[PDB]
């Protein structure tokens, strides 16, 4: 499992998971708060 976690800790896998999390957060934010143009 140590090798599997080390593989999941590589730059492309970490980048994929992080961008998926950030994109999902932004998408859900725009979903529950439609059309935010100002504060």
């Amino acid at each position: 499992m140590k090798d599997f976690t080390t593989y999941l800790s590589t730059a492309p896998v970490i980048a994929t998971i992080w961008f998926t999390f950030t994109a999902g957060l932004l998408i859900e934010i725009n979903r529950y708060f439609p059309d935010p143009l100002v504060f």
């Binding site: 090798d3 599997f4 080390t6 593989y7 590589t10 998408i27 725009n30 979903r31 059309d35």
Partner: protein, 741 residues
């Protein structure tokens, strides 16, 4: 001498230990990263199997497993298309109205305003109009419900898992030896008989038992819900006997050599179906039966383990004349030991066949309601043409790779390859001259026409009214094909295609297929195509023949296949490697295929596609190809400026995304010019200044940032150029053909 199943048990152990060690395949990358260049190298030498080790057995095993993984990816893609057609499509509604409801199989989520892309495609659905032609293909196979497509998606997923398991098993549990891979005679016998022949026979059986009765009932006006299920038709002989009386006799006429009794589902109708617009499925079934018999017969040509059959080495050595020296001596050993040579041959023939597929599919539409869908026709022709061109460029690339790495002069003393290398200068000089001649006689005609039209002298142009250059050979061949069913084809009812001549076929008010007439503009564009093809061949052949050595650099083979240059010496040796020749051939292939697809789109929208009115057929552009395609200004104004109105005003409708891509594709392409017109020295010094800025704030990474290599810069530039141009044309064609087609 014996053909058997040689294998090794558990050669590699299944573990994740190497997943945590990047670059373990190569000895140079196994050390680890020190500079950013290494990272790029990690992706550039990933599939370069003959660079990791010199063992041919290891390379062959890796190739086998790579093939299995690729087929697994393809099965995932097919299963996805079937699942999308089964749960996010309007195939059931399209079956009830294939002439008014637009095909669609993709829905978007209502987020950030993208729901506008869910256009009203018809049949009580909102989505994106697809152009892959899957609806017509499913209609041709007899699919009448979403359950069948869902089951096919599940079967595709299972097949994908099986392909992945097969790759893992053949790499870590039972890896075949090198002698098993070198059984080209047995391999060809199986691929000819088993794969092609059995696949054609199985598809013929499905077409006879499912496609033919279901599609016949669909063309007879029966509702898709009331049509019997395929197994119902496959279980009783009453329904099949009613739809086809020959089925009442069973398989008895086949064994009694009374095949003429099967003249109700195995004919030579020719032409197209007047109801659907596509080819007759009875003719396709008969076609598949004949193809299966031919391939099964061809599958018993080479000797495997018995005396009967052939030895390809014997046939190759028996072919030798007085003007070729020794002949094909050593070619068998070349193709049985070098994967790059086989890849070159396969990629060339595969790309050529892909382009042939595109031409045969627009000319003879085999799927029902396919010709009436102009979007699908244009997209399919363009897609298959691009795939064929890319595969051809790859063929030239692998030919150069074989010439650099796997070529050995000790086994090519006086054969054909050695003589070709001996007179490569004459080959390149004559091909260069014919390229110049074709360029002058092809481009000068358009420039002369532009000049005469601008100078107010239309009578001095090269057109039908003025000096005409009629393609008499093509017109005569068209006439011969049109008259063939009366003298040379007594058993054929109609011609192979309607483009030769005769009456046109229209379905649902739209012209399915009408005859195509060639004039001066067609002659000029055909010569343009020939010139561009010749130049692409010149660049690729020059990179293949001069890959080992040249008059400028005699030891090019020592520098490898992919290297930037040999220095600024000898006046400058920039782009002397064979890789750079492939890099230039990519641009020329893009130019050639772009002109090909432009000519196809203009000719189809001008003289073939169009609505059907009362006593007359009106085309999309009004038949302006025979008058405006002989000048560059005509191509820029009538075909590029006029036809791009749909993609630029698509904003606010369901095609707005295309417009966005139309702009985005203009960006990427221009982005390519940053990597093609500059050099890495400037970028390295700029990176040094940025590194100083990082060092000041203690934010400099340990991995030293290095600019892209020269070869990487060229690859990035050509990749962006191709993506930008292809995506631009894709958006323009799709938006235009969907709006007015």
């Amino acid at each position: 001498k014996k053909v058997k199943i040689a294998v090794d048990r558990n050669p590699v152990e299944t573990s994740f230990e190497k997943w945590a060690k990047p670059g373990h395949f190569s000895r140079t990358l196994s050390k680890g990263p020190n500079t950013t260049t290494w990272i790029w190298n990690l992706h550039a030498d990933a599939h370069d199997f003959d660079s990791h080790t010199s063992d041919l057995e290891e390379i062959s095993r890796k190739v086998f497993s790579a093939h299995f993984g690729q087929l697994g990816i393809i099965f995932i893609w097919l299963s996805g298309m079937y699942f999308h057609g089964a749960r996010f499509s309007n195939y059931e509604a399209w079956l009830s109205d294939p002439t008014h409801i637009k095909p669609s199989a993709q829905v978007v989520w209502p987020i950030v305003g993208q729901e506008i892309l869910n256009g009203d495609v018809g049949g009580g659905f909102q989505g994106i109009q697809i152009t892959s032609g899957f609806f017509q293909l499913w209609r041709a196979s007899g699919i009448t419900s979403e359950l069948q497509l869902y089951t096919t998606a599940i079967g595709g997923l299972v097949m994908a898992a099986a392909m992945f398991f097969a790759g893992w098993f053949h790499y870590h549990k039972a890896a075949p030896k090198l002698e098993w891979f070198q059984n080209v005679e047995s391999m060809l016998n199986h691929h000819l008989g088993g794969l092609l022949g059995l696949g054609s026979l199985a598809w013929a059986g499905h077409q006879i038992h499912v496609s033919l009765p279901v599609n016949k009932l669909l063309d007879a006006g029966v509702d898709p819900k009331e049509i019997p299920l395929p197994h119902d038709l496959l279980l009783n002989r009453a329904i099949m006997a009613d739809l086809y009386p020959s089925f009442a006799k069973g398989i008895a006429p086949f064994f009694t050599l009374n095949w003429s009794e099967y003249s109700d589902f195995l004919t030579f109708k020719g032409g197209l179906n007047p109801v659907t617009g596509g080819l007759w499925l009875s003719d396709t079934a008969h076609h598949h039966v004949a193809i299966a018999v031919l391939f099964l017969v061809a599958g018993h040509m080479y000797r495997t383990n018995w005396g009967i059959g052939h030895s390809m080495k014997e046939i190759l050595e028996a072919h030798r004349g007085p003007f070729t020296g020794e002949g094909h001596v050593g070619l068998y050993e070349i193709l049985t030991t070098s994967w790059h040579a086989q890849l070159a041959i396969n990629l060339a023939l595969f790309g050529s066949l892909s382009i042939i597929v595109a031409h045969h599919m627009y000319a003879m539409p085999p799927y029902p309601y396919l010709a009436t869908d102009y979007g699908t026709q244009l997209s399919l022709f363009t897609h298959h043409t691009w795939i064929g061109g890319f595969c051809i460029v790859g063929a030239g690339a692998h030919a150069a790779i074989f010439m650099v790495r796997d070529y050995d002069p000790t086994n090519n003393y006086n054969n054909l390859l050695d003589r070709v290398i001996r007179h490569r200068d004459a080959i390149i000089s004559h091909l260069n001259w014919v390229c110049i001649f074709l360029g002058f006689h092809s481009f000068g005609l358009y420039i002369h026409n532009d000049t005469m039209s601008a100078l107010g002298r239309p009578q001095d142009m090269f057109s039908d009214t003025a000096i005409q250059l009629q393609p008499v050979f093509a017109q005569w061949i068209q006439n011969t094909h049109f008259l063939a069913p009366q003298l040379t084809a007594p058993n054929a009812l109609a011609a192979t295609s309607l483009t030769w001549g005769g009456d046109l076929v229209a379905v649902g008010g739209k012209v399915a297929m009408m005859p195509i007439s060639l004039g001066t503009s067609d002659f000029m564009v055909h010569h343009i195509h020939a010139f561009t093809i010749h130049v692409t061949v010149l660049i690729l052949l020059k990179g293949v023949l001069f890959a080992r050595s040249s008059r400028l650099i005699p030891d090019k083979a020592n520098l490898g296949f992919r290297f930037p240059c040999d220095g600024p010496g000898r006046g400058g040796t920039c782009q002397v490697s064979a890789w750079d020749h492939v890099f230039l051939g990519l641009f020329w292939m893009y130019n050639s295929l772009s002109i090909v697809i432009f000519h196809f789109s203009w000719k189809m929208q001008s003289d073939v596609w169009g609505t059907v009115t009362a006593s007359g057929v009106s085309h999309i552009t009004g038949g302006n190809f025979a008058q405006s395609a002989n000048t560059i200004n005509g191509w820029l104004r009538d075909f590029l400026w006029a036809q791009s109105s749909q993609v630029i005003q698509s904003y606010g409708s369901a095609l707005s995304a295309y417009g966005l891509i139309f702009l985005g594709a203009h960006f990427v392409w221009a982005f390519s010019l940053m990597f093609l017109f500059s050099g890495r020295g400037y970028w390295q010094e700029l990176i040094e200044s940025i590194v100083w800025a990082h060092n000041k704030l203690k934010v400099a990474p340990a991995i030293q940032p290095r600019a892209l290599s020269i070869t990487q810069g060229r690859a990035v530039g050509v990749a962006h150029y191709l993506l930008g141009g292809i995506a631009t044309t894709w958006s323009f064609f799709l938006a235009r053909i969907i709006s007015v087609g």
